[PDB]
């Protein structure tokens, strides 16, 4: 089970399954060319990066499900920062 | 055929008129209803041949649709706003006559009518 460490601008570290972090085209690019298991985000704070990690978990659990799936919830207070992060991360 | 000709939209023997209320009925009321998700059944006369409704034009003596109303407004057919409003009411009433009270088409008509009543509630005074 390969894990990767995603580090927020404010120094929180998030350890997620590599396969889950590859939901992000940006992270995929950043880890491309082994021939690296740590990624620093200078402009994504911890409250946003935490929520992004929950999206990765949600995406891998429910993509290609044959049946119903729940709504990914986003509080109004985080929506703009999460939009910026999602745009940056290509996920 | 099963289908009568549609109602006339232009009649040289019928006095034509335009008022600011009839303008509002075209530019605001008809436009809003025309653009509604459920307008499509009401945008043209009921095609009783295609829909296989051999009794439609036996049950409905005064057919009316928003395509006819649109053309009547654009051709200044109506004497006043009341005449135009009567045509919208006839369109709704015909739907309610021909169809069962819980039918899909009746719910679509009721949605348009609710909106219609909200918009004519803001009809400008004649000026």
């Amino acid at each position: 089970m390969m894990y990767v460490k995603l580090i927020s601008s404010d120094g929180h570290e998030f350890i997620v399954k590599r396969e889950h972090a590859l939901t992000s085209g940006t992270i995929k690019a950043m880890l491309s060319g082994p021939g690296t298991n740590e990624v620093n985000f200078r402009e994504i704070p911890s409250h946003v990066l935490s929520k992004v990690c929950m999206y990765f978990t949600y995406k891998v659990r429910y993509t290609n499900s044959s049946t119903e799936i729940p709504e990914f919830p986003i509080a109004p207070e985080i929506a703009l920062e999460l939009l910026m992060a999602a745009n940056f991360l290509d996920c | 055929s099963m289908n009568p000709p549609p109602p006339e939209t232009s009649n040289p023997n019928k006095p034509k008129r335009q008022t600011n209320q009839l303008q509002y009925l075209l530019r605001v009321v008809l436009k809003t209803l025309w653009k509604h998700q459920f307008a499509w059944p009401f945008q043209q006369p009921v095609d009783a041949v295609k829909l296989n409704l051999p009794d439609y034009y036996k049950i409905i003596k005064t057919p009316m649709d928003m395509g006819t109303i649109k053309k009547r407004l654009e051709n200044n057919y109506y004497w006043n706003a009341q005449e135009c409003i009567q045509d919208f009411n006839t369109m709704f009433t015909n739907c309610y006559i021909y169809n069962k009270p819980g039918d899909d088409i009746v719910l679509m008509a009721e949605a348009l009518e609710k909106l219609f009543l909200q918009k004519i509630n803001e009809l400008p005074t004649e000026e």
Binding site: P45, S46, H47, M54, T57, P76, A79 | -
Partner: protein
């Protein structure tokens, strides 16, 4: 079923899943694989409650219904510090700004 977890210590968060039927000790093995400290150097918590190694996650009150992929349940982690264990200490995340007026 599966339970979706966030295991938190200081400014470390592990996102992982496990089964209701898997044990607290088994979860410490997952932590060991990731942070390279053995189970005997770990205390796991649900809120302020120390979890027994032998209990299943279900017996600890984790459930599939309240530990969802999009809203994982938090497990507190404290590491041994020589002759003692550190106090459980989960550093808060940053805060969003005030909601903009145009968002009501």
């Amino acid at each position: 079923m599966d339970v979706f977890l966030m295991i938190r210590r200081h400014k470390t968060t592990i996102f992982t899943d496990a089964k209701e039927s898997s044990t607290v000790f088994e979860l410490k093995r997952i932590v060991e694989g990731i942070l390279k400290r053995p189970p005997d150097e770990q205390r796991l918590y649900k809120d302020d409650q120390l979890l027994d190694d032998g209990k299943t996650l279900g017996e600890c009150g984790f459930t599939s219904q309240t530990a969802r992929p999009q809203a994982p349940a938090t497990v507190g982690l404290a590491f041994r510090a020589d002759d003692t264990f550190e106090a459980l200490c989960i550093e808060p995340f940053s805060s969003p700004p005030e909601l903009p007026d145009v968002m009501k």
